[PDB]
Amino acid sequence: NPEFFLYDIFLKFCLKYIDGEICHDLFLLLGKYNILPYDTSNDSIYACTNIKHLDFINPFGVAAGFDKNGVCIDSILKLGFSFIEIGTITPRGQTGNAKPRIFRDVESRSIINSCGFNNMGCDKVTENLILFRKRQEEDKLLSKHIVGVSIGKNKDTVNIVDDLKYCINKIGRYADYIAINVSSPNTPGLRDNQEAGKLKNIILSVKEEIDNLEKNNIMNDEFLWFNTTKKKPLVFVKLAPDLNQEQKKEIADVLLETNIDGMIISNTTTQINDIKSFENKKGGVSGAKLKDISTKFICEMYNYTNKQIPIIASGGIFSGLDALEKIEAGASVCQLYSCLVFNGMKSAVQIKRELNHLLYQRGYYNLKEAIGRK
């Protein structure tokens, strides 16, 4: 598309001279007004992937934390992504930690963020998603695209489950899947919720709350779910990389026994100390410096779960091979974040071209044949 490249011109200017979040807000503004490029091409039927009954037309979506409020869904999905994970959201709106709270290092293709959970709140974000679903039923470029919702807790929330209830009971019928965020490093004591006992209780409650919306309705299931699948939203868990294996195997044993629908592996880390520009700066780091670390976590959990729980790759994906390495490790789908930051509009068209070519060269009939081939 000719107009993909114009935004690559501005991109270097932005990376070198403009504050990251200002660029991020700008990005969202362009999408709000549908001034982003489009990728209307048919996707390779050899790359169409699925997570249980959730059928992704291609294995690439946009990770959570990008459109934390669903004010930019149409445009981002129209860039060429098969799905998007909005959020993470909390019941009430938050302003997050103080700015500046996002810092890019172009040289290492790395990011550090101390955003917290700044969002417009569950209620208002739900209205934004309703607007989208009503446009989706009227736009053919969106008819097959999927929208998941990452959910979390407010800093002052006492019981995480209470916040999981409100959001599920408010937005569950419009979402295609729920992502359980118990892994953000920028919320105090949030990663202590990954202890097996409570995470078990967390998963069961999420599944239960989603299961409870179906019972009390007079309308059939078709008109209950105003989403893409017309089906109950699947439940995925978001995991942090900064854990020991004892914690990982505990989690793995739990999510098998509680029948989680999936697990997003992985999230940002606080243990990276090989970035000079981020010294004395709080938050979790994203990008290339997390690529290798995450892929190994996938292998671990993919093995700790005996391949019985699907995975959603997330961390350091920039190239088609980067994705394949994570696909061959056990991931069914991949999410990108830093890639959009450093590559811009050509992110989807680049990583989809690259992956198709590699699948062809490596001798694979389809993507599923590559799952766990390592």
Ligand SMILES: Cc1cc2nc3c(=O)[nH]c(=O)nc-3n(C[C@H](O)[C@H](O)[C@H](O)COP(=O)(O)O)c2cc1C
């Ligand atoms: C500014 C920023 C905000 C983020 N917000 C969230 C979030 O709200 N919820 C979440 O689960 N992950 C969040 N993340 C983590 C990303 O979704 C992703 O897991 C991580 O950046 C790794 O992706 P990457 O290596 O491709 O950049 C955020 C990351 C950044 C940099």
Ligand SMILES: Cc1cn(C2CC2)c(=O)c2nn(C)c(Cc3ccc(C(F)(F)F)nc3)c12
């Ligand atoms: C998308 C994005 C997000 N974030 C933060 C959350 C981490 C950044 O820091 C970003 N920096 N850049 C360069 C981008 C992409 C971008 C923005 C605007 C424009 C143009 F419209 F001006 F051309 N082009 C490209 C960033």
Ligand SMILES: O=c1cc(C(O)O)[nH]c(=O)[nH]1
């Ligand atoms: O999961 C998350 C959430 C955030 C955030 O502060 O919004 N930051 C991260 O690095 N990971």
